[PDB]
């Protein structure tokens, strides 16, 4: 066990990047994958069936490893799971060799039931054969006794390397999410620092406490409980969201917590700016300051040259910034 | 006049419940690993006397997921449908929980963090759950406390809106407040929801941000209140009887008042009796409305931990309705 500290570090030396692939799949992203493998005799499915690691996921494999056109006529229960599953396959084969982090958003798998948590778990393992750090999007909160069930579900059962915390509930919760006392084990997180919705202002910035503006009191909170917990010494960590539309709260984030990890979405669907984020929030360790991109890349018709092309672009900022 | 079920908004279904039960008790159901293991021992010691009673109730032949496996019998599971055992009991245990404390329940509900942790298969017992309660007409709240930006929330909407046919859910407005538009109404179908979101949480630690933020000597969990309710106007839910109400903990009692004070008619959902150990007899006083379907006290694990949860049950419906009596 590295810890994700330690994970990070070492795969930034391998891909030197701190691009952060989000896997937000839709009912319509889904739906046309389908429909374009089901019209181009099934070419990316073939593909997913000849990578190594398929045979590893621990749900429904044989049927993931069934050919398309007997799932349609023999397994048709098992339709949607199969083209979700082979969709986010799909998306991880074509894009992998860019990926510091892949990002799954919870959301997105739990709309249809049971079935998208298979799914999850499976890309999980998947990228887990892979060896690629990953972070689950799920922006709990809860009471100790509830959140432990989180715990739990991130970290053992997937066996993510992170998560994303919505700390406003207070800032105990996180001695049950990134620690596990009874197995003395020890876990990382993101906590909601600065976010990208239009209307982020109206808490996050509006409330205060002696002249400190609120996102700056909870980054604070967040690090006195990350020091609490002793994770960085365990390495582990509590870093922050921070949008990639929030360039004055990026720069004074990077500013006055100078070796924060942070974790910013924003870029691309959400039309943040790129070279102003990276620069912002720029850090030597560049795994620091994690790039997601979701829909740009798996909204683009062409996801691997969507990938390599922010791949190249972030390269770019960071020997500029260097 | 009449409507069948599922067919009213949640203000009207609420009120009508509490107009045929006289409580605002809302039962908790959170079953962990524990209980789940302790009911699976306690049937096999009892030759399963109340999963053969859950098999009789006509609506469990009306839930989605595995009824084949559902309907089985008990030992049949055991030694031919090994894989299907905790499933099967994790369903059985929550349909015995319903079927004993219903008859005093104003609503159910349901957190989800005990429904994930083992994967999918918690999440099949959850639609469950929900549509057994939908068969019998009882007011549900998803407790997720959910929060994203607007197209990711969209799918929360669906899965608890359209997928459980939740009643309502707990949301976290800390993001932002333009998230409740893609939470409590759907612009595709033209529907309305409710929800209730953090105001006053009962963790030890709550005062951290709730009440030590501030803008111009409003407290934080003030002004999430009231943007919230600015939010509910804007939606026109109450028109379409629906609400966005309130989260203030049990144990929040100069919170309550204020909340109560400032905001007559609102809907407010009390967790932290029972387990948590908070004060009943404060939490109803300071959160009392005549209208008590606005003073929801939830009780889950000193209903659902009890060996008998039927008078557990009666007698915290019991007790609340001795204090509603005083406030009457
Ligand atoms: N966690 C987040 C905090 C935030 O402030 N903004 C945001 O977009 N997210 C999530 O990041 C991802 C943005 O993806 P995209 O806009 O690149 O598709 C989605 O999973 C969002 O829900
Ligand atoms: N949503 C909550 C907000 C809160 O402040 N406290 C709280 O306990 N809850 C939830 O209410 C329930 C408390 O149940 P119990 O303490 O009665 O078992 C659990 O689902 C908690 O996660």
Do not use: W
């Amino acid at each position: 066990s590295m810890g994700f500290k330690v994970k990070l570090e070492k795969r930034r030396n391998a891909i030197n990047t701190c691009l952060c692939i989000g896997l937000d799949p839709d009912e319509k992203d889904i739906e046309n994958f389908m429909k374009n493998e089901k019209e181009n005799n099934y070419n990316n499915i073939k593909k997913n069936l000849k990578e190594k690691y398929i045979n590893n996921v621990s749900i429904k494999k044989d049927i993931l490893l069934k050919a398309p056109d007997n799932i349609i006529r023999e397994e048709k229960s098992e339709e949607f799971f199969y083209f979700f599953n082979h969709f986010c396959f799909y998306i991880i084969n074509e894009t992998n060799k860019y990926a510091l982090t892949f990002k799954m958003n919870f959301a997105f798998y739990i709309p249809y039931g049971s079935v998208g948590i298979d799914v999850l778990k499976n890309v999980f393992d998947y990228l887990y054969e892979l060896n690629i750090p990953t972070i689950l999007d799920m922006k709990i909160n809860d009471i100790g006794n509830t959140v432990k069930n989180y715990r739990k579900f991130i970290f053992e059962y997937l066996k993510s390397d992170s998560c994303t915390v919505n700390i406003y509930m207070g800032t105990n919760m996180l001695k049950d999410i990134c620690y596990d006392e009874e197995k003395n084990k020890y876990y990382s997180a993101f906590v909601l620092v600065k976010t990208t919705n239009p209307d982020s202002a109206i808490f996050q910035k509006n409330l205060s406490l002696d002249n400190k503006q609120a996102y700056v009191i909870m980054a604070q909170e967040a690090l006195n409980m990350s020091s609490y917990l002793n994770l960085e010494q365990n390495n582990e960590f509590i870093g922050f969201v921070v949008g990639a539309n929030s360039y004055d709260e990026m720069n004074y984030i990077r500013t006055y917590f100078p070796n924060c990890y942070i974790l910013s979405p924003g870029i691309g669907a959400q039309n943040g700016d790129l070279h102003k984020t990276l620069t912002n929030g720029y850090h030597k360790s560049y795994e620091k300051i994690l790039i997601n991109i979701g829909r740009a890349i798996t909204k683009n018709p062409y996801p691997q040259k969507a990938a390599q092309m922010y791949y190249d672009q972030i390269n770019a900022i960071l020997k500029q910034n260097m």
